[PDB]
Design a protein around this ligand. Structure first.
Ligand SMILES: C/C=C\C/C=C\C/C=C/C/C=C/CCCC(=O)O[C@H](COC(=O)CCCCCCCCCCCCC)COP(=O)(O)O[C@H]1[C@H](O)[C@@H](O)[C@H](OP(=O)(O)O)[C@@H](O)[C@H]1O
Ligand SMILES: CC(C)CCC[C@@H](C)[C@H]1CC[C@H]2[C@@H]3CC=C4C[C@@H](O)CC[C@]4(C)[C@H]3CC[C@]12C
Ligand SMILES: CC(C)CCC[C@@H](C)[C@H]1CC[C@H]2[C@@H]3CC=C4C[C@@H](O)CC[C@]4(C)[C@H]3CC[C@]12C
Ligand SMILES: CC(C)CCC[C@@H](C)[C@H]1CC[C@H]2[C@@H]3CC=C4C[C@@H](O)CC[C@]4(C)[C@H]3CC[C@]12C
Ligand SMILES: CC(C)CCC[C@@H](C)[C@H]1CC[C@H]2[C@@H]3CC=C4C[C@@H](O)CC[C@]4(C)[C@H]3CC[C@]12C
Ligand SMILES: CC(C)CCC[C@@H](C)[C@H]1CC[C@H]2[C@@H]3CC=C4C[C@@H](O)CC[C@]4(C)[C@H]3CC[C@]12C
Ligand SMILES: O=C(CCCN1CCN2c3cccc4[nH]cc(c34)C[C@@H]2C1)c1ccc(F)cc1
Ligand SMILES: CCCCCCCCCCCCCCCC(=O)O
Ligand SMILES: CCCCCCCCCCCCCCCC(=O)O
Lengths: 230, 328, 45, 219, 278
C-alpha cells in the first residue's frame, strides 16, 4: 500500500515537501511516478524517477521548481517543491510502476494528499464527456491520438484507468490489449493506429466512474479529458 | 524365459530397416547456422536450460548459484533468482510461464513463483522426499510436475499438497534424463543401466522397455509426432526407438566422434536431429538419411544443454564456457 | 514386468517408417532451420 | 531501446549485471575444500572442532582466510556422474580411521580402494590431497590387543604404535601414481582443537605458493 | 655496405614487430589468458611494439645514412620518444618482478586483494616515470642527432632509467630465489631417492630460469648505460670506434624482441593458446 503526506495550506512563493511511505512490496525495484489531479479537472503527470535513481524526468509546468528523490532503505519517496504557483493546487497521487517484458506499469495508485494554495507533446482527445448508462447494457468509449502509438517493435502504448467517485484511479487495461490482474473479464479494449476504443459488456453499478486514457510512447505522459458514466 | 519370447516377437516385424525405405528420399543437404545473440553474465558452468512456450523467454541454470531468465530478442535479463543451493543439475519452465523449477545434488526440488504481487520472485514449494540427486524435472500443469532423481526412481508431485502422489520404480541404474510426451499421457526416462523405459502417468506403471546402448544414457527426447524418441549415451551414438514397433530403427554414429552425446533435441518437423557432444561442438544429423548435415562449433569447453523453440525459429545451446548461443 | 511387455500388439517396422516419413514430409515447410526463412521476416535479424 | 519502457528494461538489465558481478567478485576469494571419507572415518569430529540431507556446506574463517567445505557422503549415488561438479577445488580432505578393523564387508581395504580411485581420478589430476588419520588413541589399544598382521599379512614390523602408524601412512601414500603432479599431506588427528585448522591452513598456503611458483616458471 | 645492413635492420624490425603483435593478438583474442600477470605481459608487449613501430625505423635510417636528414624538430621528437618508450619498457620488467614477488611472498594478498587495478596502477606508474624522464630535455634544457651531454642530466637520466630498476630487480629476484629454494627443500629407499632427484631437478630448473632472465637483461642493457655514464665525463680522451658504439646502441634495441620471447613464448599457457587459435 501507498500513503502520501505533506499537504496543507501554503502561500504563493513558499516551499513544501511531500512524502510517501511504501510497504508490503519491494519498493527498491519499482519506479515511482507523481500524478496530480486538480479539484475539478482531470489527471496531470508531474514527475518520474526510475529504480536506483538512475533516471529522473520533470514536466515543463514544474521543471526547475520541484525536485524528486528516493530513500530506498526506508521505502520512502519525497517531492520537494519551491515557488508554488496558483495552478499547483491539486490532489497528488503516488503511482507504482515496473518495466520489464510482460510487466504492467501503473498497476497501483496511492490514496493521495490535498495541497491548497491561496491567491510537440502527444495530445489525447476524448470526444464524449458524459454517457448515460443503465445496468445490463453494453457501452463503448472512444479515444484518439494526435500521433501514432504503434511503435516499430509492435507495442501499442495505450493505458486505460477507471476512477470511481471518491476513489483513486486504478489500472484497467495496459498496452491496449492486456487486462490488469483482478479486472473482470467484461472489460475489453481494442484499437489501431491513432484511434482506440474501450468496450464494457453487461455494465453494472460498480462500473460508475470516470475513465481516463494515457499514452506511454514517450514523455511527457499525457492524460485524456476523461469520460463520465452515470 | 519371456526375454526369448520378446526377442522372437520383435525380430519377426523387422522385414526392412528404415534405412532401406529411406533410400528413395532425397538428402536434406547442407545446413549452416550462425550466432546472432551471445548471452553472457554467468560466471560458472551452465548445466541446464529450457525454452519458454512463447519462444522468446528462456531460463538457464548455472553452478554459480544463479539461474537467469533471458529475453532472447533484446538479450535483456528479466529476473535473477538467487538459489539456496549452488549445485544445480536441472531446470524447467512452466508451460504457462507462471512458475520455474530447478534442482540438483540436493534431494529436493524448488519451485519459484514469478507473478508475485510483491514483484520479487519467491519460493512456492520445496518438493522433498527423494534420497538421490535430482536429475530432471518437467511441468505437466501448474499443479503437477514429474521429477527424476539418482535414486533410480521417478515420482509425480502435486505442488499444492507438496508430496509425491505416485512413484515410478524399475530402473537398475540412476535415471539421467526425462521427457514428457506431447499429450502428457506418457513419459520416458533414461538410466545408467543403458535401458530406456516408458511409463504411464495415469496408471503409474511401466509399459515398455528399450535396450541396445552399451553405456549410460545421458539424454532423451520425444519425436514431434510422439510415436518415437531418441537417446544420447556415452557410446557416441544416437539411437531412435519407435513405441509401436518396440524396436530400434537406426543408430547415428561416426568413427571420428569420441566422447559421445550429452544432450538431444529435435526440430519442429523432426527432419533433423540435434545433439550436444563433449567435443564442445553440436552436430546436426538427418533423422531419415542418418547423415551429419552440419556442425554448430561455437563453444570452447563442452555442450551441456540445448533446446529448440516450440516455434522452431531458432535453437539455443548451453555450455560449460558460461555462455549461451542461439542458432538458426 | 516382462509379462506385460510380451503381450502387446507390435506393428510392422515398414509401416512405422512410412508413417514417420509421411509426417516429416507433411511438415517440411514448417522448419525455418531446414529452409532458411528470408531475412526480411526473420525476427532475429 | 528507442521506445519508452524499453530503456527502463535496459537499465534493469544493467542493474542485474552489476549485482551479478558484485556477487561473483565476492565468491572468487573463497577457498573451496572437498571433504571425503567413509561414514565411520570420523569426519564429524573435524566439523565439530571447526565449529568450536544432501550436500552439506560448512563455512569458517581462519587467520583472515575464508574456507568452504562440502561433504558429499550424505547422499548415496553414482559418484562418476557428479564427481566432476567439484573440479577446480583447492584441495581434497580424506578421512581414514586407523582402528577400522572391526568389521569385514576389510573396511581398511575399502578405504584404500576409495583413496586410490579418488586420487587417480582424471578430474583431480593436479588437485592435492590432505589425509587425516583419526582414532589414534583407539588404535593404540587395538595394536596391543590385536596384531596389525590381521589386515596386512605381509607386515613384518614390531607391534607398536610408532611403527604401525608409519607403515599405514606409507601404505596409503603409495597409491598415487602421479607424485610429480600432486603431493599428499598426512596428519594424525589430535584432541586439541588448534592443530587441525592450523595444518589445513598451512597445507592450503603451501599449495597456493607452489601453484604461484609453477605459474612463474620456477617450480 | 648499405644494402646488407639495411636488409639486416629491416629483418630485425620486422621480427620485433611480429613478435609483439602476435602476443598482443593472442592476449586480446583468447579468454583464458585474461589475468593480472598477462595484463602486465600484454602491456610490455604493447610498449615493445610501439618502440619497434615509432623508433626503430628512424634509428635504422639514421644508421644507414650516417646523418640526420629529417630536421632538428624531428631529432627532438625522436629523442623524446626513444627516452620515454625505452624507460617504460625497462620499468615494465621491474613491475612484473614486483608483481611476482607479491604473488610468491604473500598469498593472502594474492587471494583477497589482487585485482587488475594493481596492473593498471603499475602500468600508469611506468609511463609516469617515462614521461618524467623524457620531458625534461625538451622542456628547459646540427648535421647529426645527439642527446644532451650535460653532466647532471646524463647522471640523473641514467640513474632513473637503469640503475635503480636494476637494483630493484636484483633484490626482488634474490628474494624469489630464496623463497623458491626454501619451498623446494621443505625397497623404501627408492621413494626417497626419487624425491631427492625431483628436488634437484626443480632446483636446477629454477636456477636456469633466473639465470636466463638476469643474464638476458644484463647483456641487453648494461653496456649501453655504462657507455652513456662514462663518455660525458671522459669524452675528451675517449677513442672508441664507430662500430663499437653502433653495436652497443643496437644491443639495447634487441631487448624489444627478447622480452616477448622470454615472457610469452617460453610460457606453457601462451604456447597452448597459440596452438588453440591456429
Ligand atoms: C630452453 C627451453 O627448453 O626452452 C623452453 C621452451 O622453448 C623451446 O623449447 C623453444 C622454455 O624453458 P623451459 O621449458 O625449459 O623452462 C621454463 C623457462 O626457463 C622459464 O623461464 C619459463 O617462464 P618464465 O620464467 O616466466 O620466463 C617457463 O615457462 C618454462 O618454460
Ligand atoms: C637477427 C634477427 C633479425 C633474426 C633472429 C630473430 C629471432 C628469429 C631469433 C632471435 C632469438 C632466437 C631465439 C633465442 C633463444 C632460443 C632458445 C632455444 O632454446 C630455442 C630457440 C630460440 C627460441 C631462439 C629461435 C630464434 C630467435 C627467436
Ligand atoms: C603504435 C602502434 C604499435 C599501434 C598500437 C595500437 C594499440 C595501442 C592498440 C592495437 C589493438 C588495441 C587493443 C585491441 C583490443 C582491445 C580489447 C578491448 O576490450 C580493450 C582495448 C584493447 C586492449 C585495445 C587497446 C589498444 C590496442 C592494444
Ligand atoms: C576486466 C578488466 C577490469 C581488465 C582491464 C585491464 C586494463 C587495466 C588494461 C587492458 C588494456 C590496457 C591498456 C592497453 C594499452 C594501453 C596503451 C598504452 O599506450 C598505455 C597503457 C594502456 C592504456 C594500457 C593500460 C591497462 C589496460 C587498460
Ligand atoms: C642479445 C642476445 C644475443 C643475448 C642472449 C644471450 C643468452 C642466450 C645467454 C645470456 C645469459 C645465459 C644464461 C646465463 C646463466 C645460465 C645458468 C646456467 O646454469 C645454464 C645456462 C644459462 C641459462 C645461460 C644460457 C644463455 C643465456 C640465457
Ligand atoms: C640475436 C639478435 C636477434 C639480436 C642481436 C643482433 C645484433 C647483435 C646485430 C644484428 C646486425 C648487427 C648490425 C649489423 C650492421 C651494422 C652496421 C655497422 O656499420 C654498425 C653496427 C651494425 C648496426 C650492427 C650492430 C649489431 C647488430 C644490430
Ligand atoms: O640518437 C640516437 C639514439 C641512440 C639510442 N638512445 C640513446 C639515449 N638512450 C637513453 C638516454 C637516456 C635515458 C635513457 N633511457 C633509455 C634509453 C636512454 C635508450 C636511449 C637510446 C641514434 C644514434 C645513432 C643511430 F644510428 C640511431 C639513433
Ligand atoms: C605497423 C603497425 C602494426 C600494428 C599491429 C597491431 C595489432 C593489434 C591486434 C589486435 C587484435 C584484436 C582482435 C579483437 C577481435 C574481437 O574481439 O572482435
Ligand atoms: C601514455 C600513458 C597513458 C596511460 C593510461 C592508463 C589508462 C588506465 C585505465 C584503467 C584505470 C583504472 C583505475 C586505476 C586507478 C589507480 O589505481 O590510480
Amino acid at each position: 500500500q501507498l500513503v502520501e503526506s505533506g499537504g496543507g495550506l501554503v502561500q504563493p512563493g513558499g516551499s513544501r515537501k511531500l512524502s510517501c511511505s511504501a510497504s508490503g512490496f519491494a519498493f527498491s525495484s519499482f519506479g515511482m511516478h507523481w500524478v496530480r489531479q486538480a479539484p475539478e479537472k482531470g489527471l496531470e503527470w508531474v514527475a518520474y524517477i526510475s529504480s536506483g535513481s538512475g533516471t529522473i524526468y520533470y514536466a515543463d509546468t514544474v521543471k526547475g521548481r520541484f525536485t524528486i528523490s528516493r530513500d530506498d532503505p526506508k521505502n520512502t519517496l519525497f517531492l520537494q517543491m519551491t515557488s508554488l504557483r496558483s495552478e499547483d493546487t491539486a490532489m497528488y497521487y503516488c503511482v507504482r510502476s515496473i518495466y520489464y517484458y510482460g510487466s504492467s506499469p501503473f498497476d497501483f495508485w496511492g490514496q493521495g494528499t490535498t495541497l491548497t494554495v491561496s491567491s510537440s507533446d502527444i495530445v489525447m482527445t476524448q470526444a464524449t464527456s458524459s454517457v448515460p448508462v443503465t445496468p445490463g447494457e453494453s457501452v463503448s468509449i472512444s479515444c484518439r491520438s494526435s500521433k501514432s502509438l504503434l511503435h516499430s517493435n509492435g507495442n501499442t502504448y495505450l493505458y486505460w484507468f477507471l476512477q470511481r467517485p471518491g476513489q483513486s484511479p486504478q489500472l484497467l487495461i495496459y498496452r491496449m490489449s492486456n487486462l490488469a490482474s483482478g479486472v473482470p473479464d467484461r472489460f475489453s479494449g481494442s484499437g489501431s493506429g491513432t484511434a482506440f476504443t474501450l468496450t464494457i459488456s453487461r455494465l453494472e453499478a460498480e462500473d460508475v466512474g470516470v475513465y481516463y486514457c494515457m499514452q506511454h510512447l514517450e514523455y511527457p505522459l499525457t492524460f485524456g479529458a476523461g469520460t463520465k458514466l452515470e | 524365459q519371456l526375454k526369448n519370447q520378446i526377442r522372437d516377437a520383435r525380430k519377426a516385424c523387422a522385414d526392412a530397416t528404415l534405412s532401406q525405405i529411406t533410400n528413395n528420399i532425397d538428402p536434406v543437404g547442407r545446413i549452416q547456422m550462425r550466432t546472432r545473440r551471445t548471452l553472457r553474465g554467468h560466471l560458472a558452468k551452465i548445466y541446464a536450460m529450457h525454452w519458454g512456450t512463447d519462444s522468446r523467454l528462456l531460463v538457464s541454470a548455472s553452478q554459480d548459484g544463479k539461474l537467469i531468465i533471458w529475453d532472447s530478442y533484446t538479450t535483456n535479463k528479466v529476473h535473477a533468482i538467487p538459489l539456496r543451493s549452488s549445485w544445480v543439475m536441472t531446470c524447467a519452465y512452466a508451460p504457462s510461464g507462471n512458475y520455474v523449477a530447478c534442482g540438483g545434488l540436493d534431494n529436493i526440488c524448488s519451485i519459484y513463483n514469478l507473478k508475485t504481487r510483491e514483484g520479487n520472485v519467491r519460493v512456492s514449494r520445496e518438493l522433498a522426499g527423494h534420497t538421490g540427486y535430482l536429475s530432471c524435472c518437467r511441468f505437466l500443469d501448474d499443479n503437477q510436475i514429474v521429477t527424476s532423481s539418482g535414486d533410480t526412481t521417478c515420482a509425480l508431485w502435486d505442488i499444492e499438497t507438496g508430496q509425491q502422489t505416485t512413484t515410478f520404480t524399475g530402473h537398475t541404474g540412476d535415471v539421467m534424463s526425462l521427457s514428457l510426451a506431447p499429450d502428457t499421457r506418457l513419459f520416458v526416462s533414461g538410466a545408467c543401466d543403458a535401458s530406456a523405459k516408458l511409463w504411464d502417468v495415469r496408471e503409474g506403471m511401466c509399459r515398455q522397455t528399450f535396450t541396445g546402448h552399451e553405456s549410460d544414457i545421458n539424454a532423451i527426447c520425444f519425436f514431434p509426432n510422439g510415436n518415437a524418441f531418441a537417446t544420447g549415451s556415452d557410446d557416441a551414438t544416437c539411437r531412435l526407438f519407435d513405441l509401436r514397433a518396440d524396436q530400434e530403427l537406426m543408430t547415428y554414429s561416426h568413427d571420428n566422434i569420441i566422447c559421445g552425446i550429452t544432450s538431444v533435441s529435435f526440430s519442429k518437423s523432426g527432419r533433423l536431429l540435434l545433439a550436444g557432444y563433449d567435443d564442445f561442438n553440436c552436430n546436426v544429423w538427418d533423422a531419415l538419411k542418418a547423415d551429419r548435415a552440419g556442425v554448430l562449433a561455437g563453444h570452447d569447453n563442452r555442450v551441456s544443454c540445448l533446446g529448440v523453440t516450440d516455434d522452431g525459429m531458432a535453437v539455443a545451446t548451453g555450455s560449460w564456457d558460461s555462455f549461451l548461443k542461439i542458432w538458426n | 514386468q516382462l509379462k506385460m511387455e510380451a503381450n502387446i500388439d507390435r506393428i510392422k517396422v515398414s509401416k512405422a517408417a512410412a508413417d514417420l516419413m509421411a509426417y516429416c514430409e507433411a511438415h517440411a515447410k514448417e522448419d525455418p532451420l531446414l529452409t532458411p526463412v528470408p531475412a526480411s521476416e526473420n525476427p532475429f535479424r | 531501446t528507442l521506445s519508452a519502457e524499453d530503456k527502463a528494461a535496459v537499465e534493469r538489465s544493467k542493474m542485474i549485471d552489476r549485482n551479478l558481478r558484485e556477487d561473483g567478485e565476492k565468491a572468487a576469494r573463497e577457498v573451496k575444500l572437498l571433504l571425503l571419507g567413509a561414514g565411520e572415518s570420523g569426519k564429524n569430529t573435524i566439523v565439530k572442532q571447526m565449529k568450536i540431507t544432501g550436500i552439506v556446506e560448512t563455512h569458517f574463517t581462519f587467520k583472515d582466510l575464508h574456507f568452504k567445505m562440502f561433504d558429499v557422503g550424505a547422499q548415496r549415488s553414482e559418484r562418476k556422474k557428479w564427481i566432476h561438479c567439484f573440479e577446480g577445488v583447492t584441495a581434497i580432505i580424506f578421512c581414514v580411521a586407523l582402528s577400522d578393523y572391526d568389521l569385514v564387508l576389510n573396511r581398511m581395504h575399502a578405504s584404500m580402494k576409495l583413496f586410490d580411485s579418488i586420487c587417480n581420478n582424471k578430474w583431480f589430476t593436479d588437485t592435492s590431497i590432505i589425509l587425516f588419520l583419526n582414532k589414534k588413541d583407539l588404535f593404540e589399544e587395538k595394536i596391543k590387543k590385536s596384531p596389525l598382521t590381521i589386515c596386512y599379512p605381509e607386515y613384518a614390523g614390531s607391534n607398536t604404535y610408532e611403527e604401525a602408524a608409519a607403515y599405514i601412512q606409507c601404505q596409503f601414500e603409495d597409491l598415487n601414481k602421479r607424485k610429480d603432479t600432486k603431493e599428499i599431506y598426512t596428519h594424525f588427528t589430535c584432541s586439541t582443537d588448534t592443530k587441525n585448522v592450523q595444518f589445513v591452513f598451512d597445507a592450503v598456503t603451501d599449495v597456493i605458493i607452489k601453484n604461484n611458483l609453477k605459474d612463474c616458471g620456477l617450480f | 655496405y648499405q644494402v646488407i645492413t639495411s636488409l639486416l635492420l629491416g629483418t630485425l624490425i620486422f621480427c620485433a614487430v611480429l613478435g609483439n603483435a602476435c602476443v598482443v593478438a593472442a592476449i586480446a583474442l583468447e579468454r583464458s589468458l585474461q589475468n593480472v600477470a598477462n595484463y602486465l605481459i600484454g602491456s610490455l608487449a604493447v610498449t615493445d611494439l610501439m618502440v619497434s613501430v615509432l623508433v626503430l625505423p628512424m634509428a635504422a635510417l639514421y644508421q644507414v645514412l650516417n646523418k640526420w636528414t629529417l630536421g632538428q624538430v624531428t631529432c627532438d621528437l625522436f629523442i623524446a620518444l626513444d627516452v620515454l618508450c625505452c624507460t617504460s619498457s625497462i620499468w615494465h620488467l621491474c613491475a612484473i618482478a614486483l608483481d611476482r614477488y607479491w604473488a610468491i611472498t604473500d598469498p593472502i594478498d594474492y587471494v583477497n586483494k589482487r585485482t587488475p587495478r594493481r596492473a593498471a596502477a603499475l602500468i600508469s606508474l611506468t609511463w609516469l616515470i617515462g614521461f618524467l624522464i623524457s620531458i625534461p630535455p625538451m622542456l628547459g634544457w646540427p648535421d647529426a642527432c645527439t642527446i644532451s651531454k650535460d653532466h647532471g642530466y646524463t647522471i640523473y637520466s641514467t640513474f632513473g632509467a637503469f640503475y635503480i630498476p636494476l637494483l630493484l630487480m636484483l633484490v626482488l629476484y634474490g628474494r624469489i630465489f630464496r623463497a623458491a629454494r626454501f619451498r623446494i627443500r621443505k625397497k623404501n629407499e627408492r621413494n626417497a631417492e626419487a624425491k631427492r632427484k625431483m628436488a634437484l631437478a626443480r632446483e636446477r630448473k629454477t636456477v636456469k630460469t633466473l639465470g636466463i632472465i638476469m643474464g638476458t637483461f644484463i647483456l641487453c642493457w648494461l653496456p649501453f648505460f655504462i657507455v652513456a655514464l662514462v663518455l660525458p665525463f671522459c669524452e675528451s680522451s675517449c677513442h672508441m670506434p664507430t662500430l663499437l658504439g653502433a653495436i652497443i646502441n643496437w644491443l639495447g634495441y634487441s631487448n624489444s624482441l627478447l622480452n616477448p620471447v622470454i615472457y610469452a613464448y617460453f610460457n606453457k599457457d601462451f604456447q597452448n593458446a597459440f596452438k588453440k587459435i591456429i
